[PDB]
Write a protein that binds this ligand. Structure first.
Ligand SMILES: NC(=O)CC[C@H](N)C(=O)O
Ligand SMILES: NC(=O)CC[C@H](N)C(=O)O
Ligand SMILES: NC(=O)CC[C@H](N)C(=O)O
Ligand SMILES: NC(=O)CC[C@H](N)C(=O)O
Lengths: 409, 301, 326, 151
């Protein structure tokens, strides 16, 4: 019951009677948790105004700090006591940096045969970022370059529909089994519905379920608000250059839309073009690896954004989409991925991999070069290497196994 | 620098900022669904001297659309690439006298000026007419980014879809121009009209647009990057139209009182320009009777 | 003085003067038969620096009527002697884009601006409405004489009896304004309309005309005599309207290529103004389709392209364009 | 009687009828249509109807239907109500030929509808109906031979 923060500060300090002010602002982010979190925003806000009239001219004092930071006391205790679900974060990031250097040597090919606005990207662009379930973050490389979220919004937009319309209404129109016929896949399953939400045939139908009665502006605006909450209000844009591409020249999607309309597999009174247009708009949302790592960490958690703590997605929505990305996220390469990686990941022709490690962390890679099946060459290698050196595979940690890094100790 | 006493300059700008913050405004442009969503209490101002001095008071960092402020920019882009004679052979260069909708043409059979909706479509039609839609927007966006010194240059597809599905008047003007042979031969109307909607939906903060206006004040040289984006003649033409045609019917009562080249927008933007001194931009959603922000236009006066 | 090396400055103007001399327009004046009798081969220009430094070449000694070049002046008489708030209660301040005849009022019921014929009648109605007709003309004439520094100022009664027997659109405008009740209370429209004809019919030479437009190139103070004719606010108010509304439909084209406050006239006059530099007054009886002198517009267009006088030059470097007063 | 469809004209008007598209979008901004009505479908139907093909023999009976109180003389079916004919004829007289509505009520006095295909659906109430074809048009968008014949 008693607030032990006063003694906690003594542990925070190194034991000396004084410390320079300069040493506190810098070197404090080493714990991973960034200083830009909304949770600790209140601390930075007040100090800026008191410095002018404080009779000290550069002293924050311990007594003043303890009183102001009262409601957010619990969060700071876990941060510096190394009670987060990933301690020794320096070692964790140190290993991540090593594979980042090694994997950089590889080079794939066939960046984009279609969507010309994607063919203009730099092949040698490579980066990665991870945001653990506790908000602890580390990014290296070209994380700050926006990239389109094509085919990564499919797991997200599926979660939007189910959490707002129920599990039985959504799956009346889209199957939940892999097709093994590429992502274009002009084919429906035995019961006359697209095989899964992840294929283009299913992504259009789930996109058709989002506010079918509203107008086009509100349909997009509804999803983008969730995608902001999912990302914790990080960077979230819209590449109109790629949206104008993939619509004049994206023709295989149009065939699917008209093929689906032919089989009358849409809900009642729904325009295919309005639903198909939204699929291009969601596909055209651009996010950075740093911002897009909070996504895939929101649904690595039970549907709560780790940074702000908001409840965005139902736990049933995250459980269902994670169980679906595992077998259907990467199309034909899902089996190869699940064999070596065994994590829920979602591919993209823009080089994005929306990697997820439930209860642990969520990554987001970027490599415009692709492989034959429509997956990033460098990004896939990192996931394969990372699992072999961090035990993230689902069927590991049996009882004791080998040493395999620190076993939660 | 052109304003040595910039510290005192902000002392007057913020005082006037608070002086006009008490005023209310007119309608909030509810005839398109998306712009009604904005909070009418937004009020911010930014300026950029041609040397690089910058100050910002208020909500300058809230993004908003260049719903009509992109007309001088796309005009300057066209002049800088194709020449003055070629561009104005398709669009007039004189004020119209009607509103910005102005479903009408002058005696010559061409739009009155490159600032009315009829003329903004034609100048948008002239930008690289032999390429596809993705390249057309990317070509314009490339110079707009360089005008803003690689500042935040976004896009608001919520507005673009809202206008593309509701902006019926602009469709009437597009089909009216196509019927009068107002486009170059072999040019599609819808591609030009669609591009015009895309440019109108470009999203900028006041900081991003303050440097964008200061380029025109600096005469085709972004102050904070030393670029050479626009030809000298292109900006001289843009300021000559943006003066007598920037604010539509309110071009008088602004040239009379303010006497500066400024451009309004239904999103509350006012792309003010002070030649050889600075470039200022003001954000205030609630419009006035003739299509300009009550707070912004009163602030400029 | 603001223009040193005057020999170099005038020498350039002389070369341009001959260059424009070859161009020929047409359609001198469809109406006012007295103006259609003028010589199409008449071409004269004059200037008057803000500090008296003046030059004149051509036919600057031939009087011509001041039709529609007294509008910025008679407006300045009312704006200074009645304040800016009162004058613009009856006339707007925005361009019309409907020619100068323009039987059309703005949305709120007032004429669009003082420069159109519908607005010049209203502003002419504001000048000493309580006095008789002789005093109304003389009141403006005294200021008009002071503006030109007591230079030549006649009255072409031949042109005044024309434009009144045959000037019918002005009468239709005059009665149209009466219907809409856009005149001050207790005012006879015909008396104000007649005053508009008389002011239009005032005749000046280019040499005397250039003294005007150097008065209001300054802050109202005359350059020759140094008097204080008009309020400083009056000159700003009228200049900001001449730039936007001076040339009517051609205002945008003129502001684009010239970017100076200039006022058109069917007599061929163009009261071009270079603020804080000088004041020009070209003369060429033949007009263009829009009601502007072909030679006068060409001279203004060429001069700005060589002397940096545009409102939006000197951005960073632009072209050389000779020394800009430095 | 004969009732066809000139698809060639239909495609010539959809691709070139640019003014009719401006009106449709101009109307849509003013909320002139009823609630929950697509303008494109309504505008498209206007193009389709204008492309319907008939002959002068088919048109003459089509005009005679309006003459005979909205009852076709050669079948006798009560195809149209009495109010529809009275409203229709009273508008063709004043609005049938647009600017030439005058100079036709003045010289002809009968309700006739002009077309750019040369037709003039001339109606003589309680007597007959008549359609005159000549593609040559005058300035006001009426057939020259047809309107001279009517006079
Ligand atoms: N494989 C993918 O990422 C699909 C890319 C995009 N949705 C398209 O179909 O064009
Ligand atoms: N003048 C404006 O701000 C409106 C711009 C927008 N493109 C429109 O015409 O609706
Ligand atoms: N310059 C002009 O427009 C001529 C005007 C005409 N002389 C009048 O008295 O009104
Ligand atoms: N005579 C007519 O009314 C011709 C109509 C034709 N469809 C048009 O739009 O011009």
């Amino acid at each position: 019951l008693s607030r032990l923060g006063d003694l906690l500060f003594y542990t925070i300090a190194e034991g000396q009677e004084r410390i320079p002010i300069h040493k506190f602002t810098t070197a404090l982010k080493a714990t991973g948790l960034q200083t830009s979190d909304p949770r600790l925003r209140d601390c930075m806000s007040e100090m800026h105004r008191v410095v002018q009239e404080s009779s000290s001219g550069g002293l924050l004092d311990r007594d003043l700090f303890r009183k102001c930071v009262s409601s957010n006391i619990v969060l700071l205790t876990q941060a510096f006591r190394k009670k987060f679900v990933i301690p020794d974060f320096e070692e964790f990031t140190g290993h991540v940096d090593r594979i980042f250097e090694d994997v950089k040597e590889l080079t794939g090919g066939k960046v984009a045969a279609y969507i010309p606005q994607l063919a203009k990207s730099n092949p040698d662009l490579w980066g990665v970022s991870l945001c653990t379930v506790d908000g602890q973050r580390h990014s290296v490389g070209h994380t700050k370059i926006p990239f389109c979220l094509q085919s990564c919004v499919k797991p997200l937009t599926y979660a939007i529909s189910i959490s707002t319309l129920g599990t039985d209404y959504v799956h009346k129109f889209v199957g939940k089994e892999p097709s093994g016929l590429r992502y274009n896949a002009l084919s429906l399953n035995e019961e006359g519905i697209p095989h899964n939400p992840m294929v283009n045939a299913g992504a259009i139908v789930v996109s058709s379920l989002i506010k079918m009665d509203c107008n086009k502006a509100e349909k997009f605006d509804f999803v983008l608000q969730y995608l902001n909450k999912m990302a914790g209000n990080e960077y979230m844009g819209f590449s109109n250059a790629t949206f104008q591409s993939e619509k004049e020249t994206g023709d295989r999607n149009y065939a699917i839309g008209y093929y689906l309309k032919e089989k009358k597999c849409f809900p009642k009174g729904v325009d295919m073009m309005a639903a198909l247009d939204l699929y291009f708009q969601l596909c055209s949302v651009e996010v950075t690896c740093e911002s897009g790592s909070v996504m895939a960490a929101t649904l690595a958690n039970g549907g709560i954004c780790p940074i702000t703590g908001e409840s965005v997605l139902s736990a049933e929505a995250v459980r269902n989409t994670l169980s679906l990305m595992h077998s259907c996220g990467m199309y034909d390469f899902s089996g190869q991925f699940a064999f070596h990686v065994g994590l829920p990941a979602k591919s993209a022709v823009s080089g994005a991999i929306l990697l997820v490690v439930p209860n642990v962390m969520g990554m987001m890679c970027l490599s415009p070069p692709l492989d034959k099946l429509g997956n990033s060459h460098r990004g896939t290698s990192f996931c394969q290497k990372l699992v072999s050196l961090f035990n993230f595979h689902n069927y590991d940690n049996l009882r004791h196994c080998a040493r395999k890094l620190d076993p939660r100790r």
